[PDB]
């Protein structure tokens, strides 16, 4: 009676191969921040000019 | 009231679920 077992095994094996091949083809929210998190967030994301002020700003840019 | 007391009243209502396990 091994023929029926072999037939069932082949039927299952075909499906196993199909599934394996398919796997193969892939080849109010702000109220909950702590004080510490507010400190972190608040530090990570916080006319006319005189010649002396413009000079210092240009120096800083350089 | 609407912002934080409204949430906290829900918290004090959810704690009834904990109270059931507290007494049992």
């Amino acid at each position: 009676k091994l023929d029926e077992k072999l037939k069932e095994l082949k039927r299952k094996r075909v499906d196993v191969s199909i599934k394996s091949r398919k796997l193969a083809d892939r080849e109010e929210k702000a109220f909950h921040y702590t004080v510490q998190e507010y400190d972190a967030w608040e530090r990570r994301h916080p006319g006319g000019i005189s010649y002396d002020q413009l000079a210092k700003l240009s120096y800083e840019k350089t | 009231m609407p912002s934080l007391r409204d949430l906290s009243l829900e918290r004090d209502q959810e704690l009834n679920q904990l109270r059931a396990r507290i007494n049992q």
């Binding site: 091994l2 072999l6 299952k12 193969a24 109220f31 507010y38 | 906290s8």
Partner: protein, 410 residues
């Protein structure tokens, strides 16, 4: 065969074609047992799923064709061959995860799938035992995932029996030097929840209180861990878990009887749990209100205001608006508040000065101030002047509402 070994040395890059060709040679030479163990070794050695599929399919069809050919006729060989065929058919899920256990052995998600595929819980324990030794904490990618493995492993015992076994396993869990702290919360919160159903919440407090043994110099330890770059375990900053403090406070607050008073032990313990959270600067705006509402429900209103004043300065002005609204709404209308009228005016003027110094829409505080000024003294003229101050000080719709109320009242 010698040439085969030579190209095994020379060409490691196309191992799949090599093993397939040598397997074909083994089948052609009648060395079926050699083909079997060779394919078994190669299948165990696969690493990429495309490579695995080709070898697994070839093994499956080889078994099928050999069994059918022998059936065409021997009994023992046929029995063994179809037994291996059925085994390889069934064990596809096991080989599937065997591939992923070599792509990244310490990715705990695969271990949480390998447990699911086991037939019986008696085997689930064995797979958990293997997983715990194979996994190294230092390389667990997703935080809070290894702790889920210890949590599930303890739950597996806890469902059947032997609570002592589960506890002794978990005591080993907390000893593991985890890199991240989400893995530690996932264990303590679960252990406390499981103890709550069995030994009462008195014990359930102890499980969490052991975790929250606040040490001296919190800033130094938090600096050492934060700047340690995964070198320092999260065991040392366990006190800095908001989720453990939150659940500990939930257990304490649900354990306080609704008619608790200042001489009750649990009410005092809840005060210390909240005050320690505030001291650690782990208090969140919803928890700062949770504490104030706990105090008000227990008729300790005058100490509720001390919570609001202790917490309002810490947050940015945008959140100070919400806490100011709560503080003033409780102060102006509550039978137990003992604030004199000049004090409540001092609070109001402080709120408006601080918030309007930062551009926050202060319409609600202005309206509340006008209503309070009408209530406490009856000076309508002062009430209107307060509303005019709000409308005259960019939130154009609010200033139109304050102009309509100020003028209608006048």
């Amino acid at each position: 065969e010698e040439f085969m070994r030579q190209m095994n040395g020379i060409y490691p890059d196309k191992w799949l074609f090599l093993i397939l060709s040598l397997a074909k040679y083994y089948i052609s030479r009648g060395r079926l047992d050699s083909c079997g163990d060779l394919l078994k070794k190669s299948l165990q050695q696969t690493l990429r799923y495309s490579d695995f599929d080709r070898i697994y399919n070839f093994y499956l069809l080889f078994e099928q064709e050999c069994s059918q050919f022998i059936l065409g006729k021997w009994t023992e060989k046929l029995q063994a061959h179809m037994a291996t065929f059925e085994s390889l058919i069934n064990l596809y899920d096991i080989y599937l995860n065997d591939v992923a256990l070599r792509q990244d052995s310490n990715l705990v998600e695969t271990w949480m799938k390998r447990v699911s595929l086991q037939k019986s819980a008696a085997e689930k324990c064995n797979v958990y035992s293997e997983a715990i030794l194979k996994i190294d904490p230092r390389k667990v990618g997703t935080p809070g995932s290894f702790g889920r493995l210890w949590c599930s492993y303890g739950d597996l015992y806890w469902r059947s029996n032997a609570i002592s076994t589960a506890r002794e396993l978990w005591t080993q869990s907390l000893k593991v030097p985890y890199p991240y702290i989400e893995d530690l919360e996932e264990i303590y919160l679960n252990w406390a929840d499981r103890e709550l159903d069995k030994e009462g919440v008195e014990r359930a407090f102890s499980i969490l209180e052991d975790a929250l043994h606040v040490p001296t110099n919190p800033e130094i330890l938090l600096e050492k861990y934060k700047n340690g770059h995964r070198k320092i375990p999260a065991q040392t900053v366990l006190f800095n878990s908001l989720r453990i403090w939150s659940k500990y406070i939930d257990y304490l607050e649900a354990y306080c009887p609704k008619d608790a008073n200042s001489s009750d032990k649990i009410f005092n313990k809840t005060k210390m749990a909240y005050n320690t959270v505030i001291d650690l600067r782990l208090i969140t705006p919803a928890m700062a209100e949770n504490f104030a509402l706990f105090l008000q429900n227990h008729y300790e209103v005058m100490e509720s205001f001390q919570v609001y004043e202790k917490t309002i300065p810490l947050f940015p002005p945008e959140i100070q608006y919400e806490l100011w609204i709560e503080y003033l709404e409780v102060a102006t209308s509550h039978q137990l508040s003992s604030l004199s009228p000049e004090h409540i005016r001092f609070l109001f003027e402080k709120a408006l000065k601080n918030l309007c110094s930062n551009g926050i829409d202060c319409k609600t505080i202005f309206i509340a101030y006008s209503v309070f000024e009408e209530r406490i003294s009856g000076l309508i003229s002062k009430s209107i002047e307060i509303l005019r101050r709000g409308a005259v000080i960019t939130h154009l719709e609010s200033r139109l509402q304050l102009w309509r109320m100020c003028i209608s009242k006048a």
